[PDB]
Amino acid sequence: VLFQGPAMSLIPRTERAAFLITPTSYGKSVLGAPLLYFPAQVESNSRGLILAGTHGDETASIAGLSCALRSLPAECLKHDVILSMNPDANQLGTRANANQVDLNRAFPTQNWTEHGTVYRWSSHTPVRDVKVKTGDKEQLEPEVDALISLIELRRPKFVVSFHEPLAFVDDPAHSDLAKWLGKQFNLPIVDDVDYETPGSFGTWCNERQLPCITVELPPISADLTIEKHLDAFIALLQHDP
Amino acid sequence: VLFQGPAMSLIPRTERAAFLITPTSYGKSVLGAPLLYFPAQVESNSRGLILAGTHGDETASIAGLSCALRSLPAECLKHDVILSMNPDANQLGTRANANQVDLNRAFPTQNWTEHGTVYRWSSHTPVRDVKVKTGDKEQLEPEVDALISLIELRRPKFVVSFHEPLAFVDDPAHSDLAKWLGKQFNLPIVDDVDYETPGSFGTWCNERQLPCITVELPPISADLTIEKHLDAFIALLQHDP
Ligand SMILES: [Zn+2]
Ligand SMILES: [Zn+2]
């Protein structure tokens, strides 16, 4: 290697409480909060979508993505960013939205059904047994409906979605983007996990041929996320795949 | 000791995604989300107020308090509960609200001023230097205004407020409640920290003679919070001080 590639130049730390990009609303939550995204600032053929907050209690990734976004000069942002697609679940401290619907079981995939499912209470609980709803067959959850119209409208080339706490990069298709992510975040890659489950966002994306990678952080606090992984998020925000 | 006091009886784990208490709104956030509290269910002379989410990125305590609340039989709840008093900052992944105001520097205390202050970027950053607003002298932030009317209306006997990541129980007055909290959460007690700062909730409470204890968790994930401290939150929700 001939020289270390340059350090990213960043908004000064002292200025980082501000958002220099005014977000645009793409909808309204069940409780009536606005759903927000920060539009990409660079024109390019590989503009995609970086997303967090599918599950309202997986917040280390929301904090890391928000800190990264506010650390990046505004004109460097290559992708649309949604800090949280489920704002009600964030203020309720729940995995599910305000109707007790797991939004990752609520996309209208071909195999979607109305029967509920169960999620795991905490990472060391031996079984998944917390009952959770998967949606109404007549009407999408508004956070789902809204994310779907946004993707229709903006056409990202890919989505990277952040979760916790499974500690892996979930790759739908042996792809370089997933390898690059595993190296950035120092996490192992697994191949094709939950891309067939009724209503998962990965299932939904595969049906549309949309590359969708999920990065599952380990169970780490927001503070450790900022201190260990800030650069990995910032890199991602500027990354060409 | 003659026998171990009885285990708390809890809603079955399988049923815990539901809230059995319908919350009441006490206001609206800057972005227009509802501000919610769950009313105490037991009549008593010592009803108080348990609160989290002053800072939008301190979410381990929101998750723990929300999981505790949904674990407790509804009729056992002795205190009002606010899972998050700053829902916009939760969906934005920021410490400050949507106007970049630190809500713990925004209460109308006697010594409140309009000058901004600075908070610490992460727990191992050597100085506080992230600039942050403290409010408008003509008008309260709506999350502050709303919490203040709620306290006026309900008259709690005490407030316990959850923060992260300082790892201590901040006691304004050498009190038993703070000792009981330090023992429950296994955290050291410190005495009179930040109860004089302009606009802090502790300063504001002291001026009204309202006992206000702050529990600062260490920097821990939500998952570890649920697994190590769930019982400590559940106990608190039923505790007579
Ligand atoms: Zn998740
Ligand atoms: Zn705090």
Structure description:
2 copies of one chain form a homodimer. With 241 residues, chain A is an alpha/beta fold. Helix content of chain A is 27%, strand content 17%. Chain A contains 6 helices and 10 strands; from the N terminus they run βββαβαββαββαβαβα. In chain A, the strands form 3 sheets. A 6-stranded mixed sheet of chain A has the order 4-3-7-10-8-9, sandwiched between helices. In chain A, strands 1-2 form a two-stranded antiparallel ribbon. Chain A is globular and about 55 Å long. At the A-B interface, helix 1, helix 2, strand 6 and helix 6 of A face helix 1, helix 2, strand 6 and helix 6 of B. The PDB classes it as hydrolase. The entry lists the keywords hydrolase. The assembly is dimeric.
The backbone outline of chain A, from C-alpha atoms, is globular
Number of strands of chain A: 10
The Rg value of chain A, from CA coordinates, equals 17 Å
Largest two-chain interface: A-B, 58 and 58 residues
PDB class: hydrolase
Keywords: hydrolase
Assembly: dimeric
Entry title: Biochemical and structural characterization of the MpaA amidase as part of a conserved scavenging pathway for peptidoglycan derived peptides in gamma-proteobacteria
Brief rundown of the structure:
Chain A is built from six helices and ten strands. Chains A and B meet through helix 1, helix 2, strand 6 and helix 6 of A and helix 1, helix 2, strand 6 and helix 6 of B. It is classed as hydrolase.
